[PDB]
Amino acid sequence: ANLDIAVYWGQNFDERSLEATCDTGNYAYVIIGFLNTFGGGQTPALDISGHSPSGLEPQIKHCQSKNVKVLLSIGGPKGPYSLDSRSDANDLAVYLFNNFLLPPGHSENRPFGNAVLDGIDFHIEHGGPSQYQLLANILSSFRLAGTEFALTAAPQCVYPDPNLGTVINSATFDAIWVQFYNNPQCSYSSGNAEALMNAWREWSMKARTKKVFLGFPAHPDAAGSGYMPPEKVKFHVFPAAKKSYKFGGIMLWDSYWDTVSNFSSKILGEGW
Numbered sequence: 001a002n003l004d005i006a007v008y009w010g011q012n013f014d015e016r017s018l019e020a021t022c023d024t025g026n027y028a029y030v031i032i033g034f035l036n037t038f039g040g041g042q043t044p045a046l047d048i049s050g051h052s053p054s055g056l057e058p059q060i061k062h063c064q065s066k067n068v069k070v071l072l073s074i075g076g077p078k079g080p081y082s083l084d085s086r087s088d089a090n091d092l093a094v095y096l097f098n099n100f101l102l103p104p105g106h107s108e109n110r111p112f113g114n115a116v117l118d119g120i121d122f123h124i125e126h127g128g129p130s131q132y133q134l135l136a137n138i139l140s141s142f143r144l145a146g147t148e149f150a151l152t153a154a155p156q157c158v159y160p161d162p163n164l165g166t167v168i169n170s171a172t173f174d175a176i177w178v179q180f181y182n183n184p185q186c187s188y189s190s191g192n193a194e195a196l197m198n199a200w201r202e203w204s205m206k207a208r209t210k211k212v213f214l215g216f217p218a219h220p221d222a223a224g225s226g227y228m229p230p231e232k233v234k235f236h237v238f239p240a241a242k243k244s245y246k247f248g249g250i251m252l253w254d255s256y257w258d259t260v261s262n263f264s265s266k267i268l269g270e271g272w
């Protein structure tokens, strides 16, 4: 199917390591979550379930050496993050750029050491659009100032998204993974994919991005609702989705669960 799979990593202290996740060969993107603290007088902080940030340095490089794109996700499902001021946007943009998207300038420091990430993922779950458009604008400007990195977003499945809808409308994102879960109005539920398919139709039609990925839970325990078994996704979801020029593949939540479920292995025919 040539399927590209994006996966979130960093949700569990005890999860399969970052390097081992990349070694699976199942993913085109691994999204480290999350920078879940910023804004509102706060200094930015990571919540990567107790994993050592510095410890990630070599793992990230290993991932990239095997051609897996490694992104940092800002926000997340939960967390004391906000971005209501223009200053907040400027601060976070410069912070992300200096620290994660450029080689060391040898002065301050960097959470992931001297590793250079392949992009930033907007997983904004609350607060409304606030100043996220400005953040994207500044990061996008950097994208044009010599640092070739990607900008992605993870909106919930109701179109348009209340938090990222406007930013998405700017066409600034290289790719978007819609969370087709935790919302019965637009995800699989009751052995019925109508709501899911209608939502996919609208997203593939209206989202101003080159690639739209369908995000699914990798296990029934991974989300409150919306889990769809892999065989059902292949049978039911792919034929229609593949007819879209914007179909990018799927996103899974998350590595910890995927390791248990073998969802990606099943979707791919076992892609070791």
Ligand SMILES: OC[C@H]1O[C@H](O[C@H]2O[C@H](CO)[C@@H](O)[C@H](O)[C@H]2O)[C@H](O)[C@@H](O)[C@@H]1O
Pocket: 050, 051, 052, 053, 054, 055, 111
């Ligand atoms: O001091 C409490 C924190 O310790 C860890 O983070 C520090 O030590 C890591 C190596 O064990 C470094 O990679 C990291 O850069 C240091 O800040 C721990 O990972 C944190 O969760 C603790 O709060």
